[PDB]
Point group: C2
Chain length 123, copies 2
């Protein structure tokens, strides 16, 4: 009669120990999930850092290329501006050539007329 009361007091004290042992392995269960996420987050971050240091050299190489291309065209612009000076002078060269070919036929009209005038006097 007294025994079944005492036996149950151990049994409650028995499942109590079973509970904390279930906890301390459930608590460690998620602790090795956190320890997994943490060491998984380092591998991600260590790659992002490795990628950015690979981007830092990338954009630096390309910025040098811009300053190299801007120098190439700043030379070209100053050249084509010097082309306009040449071409405009070849225009002035050609307007003065037209002035020479018009005087050549103007002189040709005189020779025709001054002959054409002298013939009319003969008559």
């Amino acid at each position: 009669q007294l025994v079944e009361k005492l036996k149950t007091q151990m049994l409650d004290q028995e499942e109590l120990l079973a509970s904390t042992r279930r906890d301390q392995d459930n608590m460690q269960a998620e602790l090795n999930r956190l320890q997994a996420e943490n060491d998984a987050s380092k591998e991600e971050v260590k790659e992002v850092l490795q990628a950015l240091e690979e981007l830092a050299v990338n954009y630096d190489q390309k910025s040098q290329e811009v300053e190299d291309k801007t120098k190439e065209y700043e030379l070209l612009s100053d050249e084509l501006n010097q082309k306009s000076a040449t071409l405009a002078s070849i225009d002035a060269e050609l307007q003065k050539l037209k002035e020479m070919t018009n005087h050549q036929k103007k002189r040709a009209a005189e020779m025709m007329a001054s002959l054409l005038k002298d013939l009319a006097e003969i008559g």
Copy 2:
């Protein structure tokens, strides 16, 4: 009889003047094609220069962003490395808790046995 010889001498002298006038307008024809290409090449180049100066500010803004992101992660890496210090200590915290719950039931086995021993002596 002599007239048709003289008349042809002017006619050759006439088409000769017609030729150079055709040339001096054909020569100026391509000269205003070159003057077109040249002033068309300036508008292209002036845009390339305007584009590169817009690329120079572009890559400079982005390179600053890399150094800003590398600083953000260099802070994060040093934080997650400090997370491993905490989590590993919580592991050591939990192994010492298991040491406390095992001693609790080891002490519980003694009380059962030392009672179980005293009962056998009664008999």
